[PDB]
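cache lookup: miss for this entity combination. No prior model stored, computing from scratch. Input as submitted by user K.M.:
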Amino acid sequence: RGMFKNLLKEVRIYAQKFIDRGKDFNLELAIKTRIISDGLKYSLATGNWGDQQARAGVSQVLNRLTFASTLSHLRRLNSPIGRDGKLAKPRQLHNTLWGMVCPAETPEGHAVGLVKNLALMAYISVGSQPSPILEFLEEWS
Amino acid sequence: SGIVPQLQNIVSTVNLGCKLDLKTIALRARNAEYNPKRFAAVIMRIREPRTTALIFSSGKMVCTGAKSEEQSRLAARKYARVVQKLGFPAKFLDFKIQNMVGSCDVKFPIRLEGLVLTHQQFSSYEPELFPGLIYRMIKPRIVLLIFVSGKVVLTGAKVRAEIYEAFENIYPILKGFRK
Amino acid sequence: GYKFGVLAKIVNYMKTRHQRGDTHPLTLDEILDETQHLDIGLKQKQWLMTEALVNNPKIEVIDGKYAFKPKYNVR
Amino acid sequence: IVTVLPVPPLSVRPAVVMQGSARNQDDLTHKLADIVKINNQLRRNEQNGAAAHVIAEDVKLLQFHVATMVDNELPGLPRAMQKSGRPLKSLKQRLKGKEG
Amino acid sequence: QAPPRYLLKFEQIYLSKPTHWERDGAPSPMMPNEARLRNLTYSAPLYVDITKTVIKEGEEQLQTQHQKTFIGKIPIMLRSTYCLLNGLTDRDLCELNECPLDPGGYFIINGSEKVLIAQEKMATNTVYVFAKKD
Amino acid sequence: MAYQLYRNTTLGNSLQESLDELIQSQQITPQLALQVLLQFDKAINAALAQRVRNRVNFRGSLNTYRFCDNVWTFVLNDVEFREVTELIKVDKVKIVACD
Amino acid sequence: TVPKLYRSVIEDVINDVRDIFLDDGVDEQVLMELKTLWENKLMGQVEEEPLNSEDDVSDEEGQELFDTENVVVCQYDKIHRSKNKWKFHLKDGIMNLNGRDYIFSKAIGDAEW
Amino acid sequence: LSTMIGKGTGAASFDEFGNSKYQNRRTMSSSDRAMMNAFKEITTMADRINLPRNIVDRTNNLFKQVYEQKSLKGRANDAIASACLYIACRQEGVPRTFKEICAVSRISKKEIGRCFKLILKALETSVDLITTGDFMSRFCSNLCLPKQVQMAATHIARKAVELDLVPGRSPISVAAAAIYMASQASAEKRTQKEIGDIAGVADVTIRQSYRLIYPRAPDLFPTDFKF
Amino acid sequence: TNYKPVANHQYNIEYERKKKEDGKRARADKQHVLDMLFSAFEKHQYYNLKDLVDITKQPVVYLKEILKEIGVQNVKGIHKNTWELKPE
C-alpha cells in the first residue's frame, strides 16, 4: 500500500512534467518498475520494515540446521515490547495461551517470553469481509 | 582503374559584400521564395544551369546543384547579375568552393562486413541506421558511401583531384573483396 | 484599453521629433495629427494638459506650448 | 568560546578499507569537510556581500554543524546523518557508554 | 490538468509464474533451486490494466484501454498457490531438485532463505480500559 | 484589413466599378465603399468555405513559380482542366493562392 | 447551380451589411440600389567585376502585367516538393475559365518544371 | 564528502512558522547532480527490459568516460544515456535492437542513431558487427517457442547469411524471416503481426524477406526437424 | 506485448509533427511589435516575460532586446523580479 502510493506519486510527477509543456505522454515509460521490485526485496532482505525508525528484525534468514529448527522458525511469533526493558508482566506465561502457543517453547536470555511459537493445532485466522454477516444480521431482527 | 567519378553538385559560398533587404528581393525577384517562419534565407533556382542558391541578409550567396566548377562560377555570376539588377550594389568577392559530391558504380557487389572487419578504425556499418557503409580515412577529408550494389558516393571534397585520388586510393582496397 | 495608452505614442513621437532637430515647441493638435489620435477623448485632452505633460521632467512649457527639455539633459 | 576549531589528526580519524579503492574516511573527516566548506562559504560571503539574513542563517547552520561535531545526542536539533540513515558517531558516541 | 484533462484509472491485477531474464533477455521459468544456487531473487512480475481517459473540452472522451503493463515484481513465498511448486507430486519435486518434505512458506531473496515472523499488536477497533497505576 | 484576394476578379472589378459610379455622383463616401468591399470579401470567403462541396482536377506544365509572404504566383502553360462532367482546354493559366 | 450559389451569396451579403448601415447612419435604400446595379453590371574574363558579357537570360515579364488569362483565386493547405513536381492540396477556391465561373472544394494536381 | 540534516525529534528546533530551521542544502555541484540523474535514468530504463546489472554498470562506466571526455554537451544527457545503454548491450555479446531501446526511452530513433555515431566517433572504440544469431534466443523465448524451433531458426538464419541470398538486407529482417520459417512449419503458428510486434520490423519487410527467401527452402533447414 | 519495439513514440511523432506547421517565431519589424506590446499593456498593468512571449509571439532574445529600451525591471519580493512595459 505504501509503495503503491509512492509509485502513484512518481507517475503523477512524471505526468505533470510532460503535461505542463503541452503534449501527450507514454504510459509505459511513466511507471517506474524500480520501486515495487526493489523495495519489497530491500525489506525482506534487510528485515527493516519500512522505507528505512520502523520495525526491525521482522525478516530473518531461515534456520536450516535441522528440520525441527526449520519448522519452529517458520511457526514463530514476535512481541514488540522493547527487549532490553527490565519489565516482568508481559513476559509471563498467560492463562489464555492454552493450545494457542506452546508453554515450553521459549528462547533463553534477553528475549525470554517475548519470542514464542505456535502450538501444533493453531490456525491463525486470515481474514474475511464482514459484509455477508452484516447483511445477514440486517435480514434478521 | 579505368573509372572516374561523375559529379552531381558543388557547394560554393560567395560574398556580395553589401547588406540586402530580403523582403525587397522577395517582392522583386522573378523566382523568389522567402518564408521567415521556415528559414532565415531566400531561395533562387534557374533552369538552364539547373542550379539552386540562397541568400542571407548578410549579403552571402550559397549555391548548389552545379555540374562543374565553371558551371558553378557562371551560376554565381548570373545570380550576382540578378541581385544587382534589383538596385543593390552587389560585388563578387572571395569566391571559394567548399563541398563537392560525386557518384560512381564499380559494377561488382561488395562484402561490406569484411570491409568493416579489416577497416574497423575507418569504417562504420550499421544496417538499422542506413544500409550502406560509411568509410572515413585520414589524409583525405572525405567520407565514402560503399553499397552492396556497387554504387560509391564521394562527399566532402574541396577540388576535383581530391575526388580522383580518394577514388583510386580505395579502388585497390575494394578489389580484394569481390563476390 | 483607454485613457492610458495614447500618452506613450505621444511621448515617443515627440522624443523622435526632437531627435530630428525640431527644438521648436508644438501644440497638442499638431502632435495629435501625426500620431493618428484624432479621435482622442476630451477628458484625455485635459488630463494631458493638467497632469501628464507637466509631471514628466522631459517636457518644457514655452510660451504656453510644449517642447523637449534639452537643458536638463546633458548635451 | 571557540573561534578556531582544532582539526584532529589522521590517527584520530583514519581512513578505513572496503574492497580497496574506496578508502572510506571517518565520520569526523566527512563532517570536517562540511565544516571547512561552510566556513569557506561564509568567509567569501563576508565581502561578497549578501543580505544580513543570509549571513545569519549560514552562521546558524555552522553553529549546528560545530555543535553536532562536538555533541550529537542533545535534544532539540535533528541528528546529523550520512546518506541513507546511520546517524554519525560524534565525540559523545565515541567516549561515553559501554562501547565508548 | 494543464485545458485538456487526463484521468488514469487502475483495474484488474494480473500476476504470472516466477520468471528469470538472462543476458539475452530470454524469459524462462526459474527453479527455486536455481534461485538458491545463483543467489537470485524468487519473484513474479505483476501486471495492471490501466484505462487512460482523455478530455479536450469538445466531448471527445475516447479512453485508451492500455493493457497489461509491467510495474514490478513481488517476491513469491514458496509452495503458495501462486508459485511454481504448487500442487506438484513428489516425483516431480524430486525431478526439480527440491525436497518433497520441504515445508515451504519462506521467500528467497538474493539466494538467502528469508522468513517473516508474525508480529503482534493490541487488537484494532476494540475498546480497552487500562488502569495506569501512576 | 483582410485577405483581399477576390478584388482582382470580374466580380470584384464589377463591384469596384459600381462603387466608383456611386462615388462620382457623391452619393457615398470612399470609406463606405472600402467597408462594402471588406464585407463583400468576408461574405464571399465564408460562402466559398461553407457551401461548396465539389471536386475538380487539372493537369499542366509549369514555367515560373513564385512565393512571397504566403502568396503564390504560379504560371502554367498548356493546361487541361479534367472533371467528371466536362474537360476544358486552355493555353495559359495563372495560379494565385494564400492562407 | 452556380447562379443559385450566387443568389445565396447575394442573400448573405445583404444580410451581413445591415448592421454596418445602421451603425454609420446610411439609409437602407442605397443597399437595394447597389444590388440593382450589381445585378446589371454582370448580366577569359580575368576582371570579374562587369556582368554585361551575358544577355537574353530572361523571359517575357508581361505575363503578370497582363492578367487577361484565367486567374484562379484559391487557398492552399499543403504544397510538397518531390525533386521534379509540386504536389497540390487545395481547399475551397474559385476559377474564371473562359468567362464561366467554376468552383471546387478540393483539388489535386501536379506540374513539371 | 557530505552529510544530511534530518527531521527534528524535539519541538525545540521548530520556528514560530515551523520549518524546523535546520535542513540539508544539497548543493553537491552541478556535474554530480547531472551524473546522478543520468544513473537514475539508466537504472529505470534498463529495469524495463530486465537487463542484468553488469550491463548497467558498464553503461555507467561509458557514461562517466563520455561525460569526462567533454565533447557531447550539445546533446540531451538522456541521448548519451541511451547511447551508452546500446553500447553496453553491444559489448556484452547480447545486443538489443535500436527499436527496443527506443521503446523504453523518450527519444526518437534518429537522435539515438546520431548519438551512437558521435559516441563511436568521439570515445574511440570499436564494436563488433551484429549477427543474426544473437537475436534468435530472445525472439523465440519471448514468442514462447521450444528449443527445436530455436535451433532450426538459428540454422536457417546463419545459412541464409552465409549462402548469400540477402545482399545488404538488415539482419533484423532476415532474423524475423527465420522466425517465420520455423513458425510456419510446426504445430504452433505465428501471424505476421505478432512477428512484427516482437521484432519491430514492418509486415511488408517480412513479406519482402519471405518472398526472397522462399526458393531453396529444404537446404536452409537442419538435418531433422519433424516437418 | 510489453515495450514493443517502435521507431518513434506516438506522442513524440505527434509533437514533432505539430512543430512543423505552427513554425518558428519569425523576427518581425519594430513598429508592429511595439504596437502589440502597448496594446497588450492597455489590457493589464503587469505581465510575466513568458506571458508576453506567448501573446506577442516573438523570439525571447529579440523581444527582450526591444523591451530593454523602453521597459524596466522592478523588484517584487512576493514572487520574482519582473519587467514593466511603461516607458517611465
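stored under new cache key. The first strand of chain C starts at residue 59 and ends at 62.
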